[PDB]
């Protein structure tokens with residue numbers, strides 16, 4: 001079956017691991033070492049297609065930069081995650097967007113912008129500001145909560161749909 005290589009990127013603390021574990025295992029893990037980087041797999045049906053999601057939960061700097069370049073080149077779509085209560089993590093999206101395009105040497109890379117922790121009333125990034133950024137990139141924007149599961153399937157399944165649209169060209 002088709003496998004989709006997804007990569008979850010974003011500043012430390014935004015909820016990359018929590019989102020991935022919620023997607024894969026259907027529970028909220030509120031404490032997971034920020035320095036652990038690992039891949040997870042799940043076989044799902046998306047729009048009638050039985051497929052495999054092969055998801056890299058990134059954790060930032062690698063032993064060697066070649067390891068980062070390798071996962072960006074092999075990755076097919078990227079969840080660019082910020083936390084709605086951390087403005088610096090939102091600003092960091094500019095860096096991730098650029099770095100992925102730079103490594104893949106492509107202006108057309110499937111991505112989805114994810115604003116996580118939307119169960120918290122505490123918010124420094126309003127939806128309008130995040131929509132502005134996603135509009136500038138021409139990518140979807142989804143607010144999520146790894147805690148409540150809101151938006152979680154939508155974020156990952158939308159990324160698969162973005163990969164499909166890229167492939168058909």
Ligand SMILES: Nc1nc2c(ncn2[C@@H]2O[C@H](COP(=O)(O)OP(=O)(O)O)[C@@H](O)[C@H]2O)c(=O)[nH]1
Pocket residue numbers: 010011012013014015016017018019029030031032033034116117118119120144145146147148
């Ligand atoms: N309230 C809330 N907390 C979250 C959410 N996602 C992650 N967290 C918390 O934010 C912190 C960092 O999450 P983690 O998954 O380790 O982020 P990572 O460094 O991006 O992998 C942890 O204390 C989690 O409990 C969420 O959707 N809502």
Ligand SMILES: [Mg+2]
Pocket residue numbers: 016017018032033034035036057058059
């Ligand atoms: Mg993590």
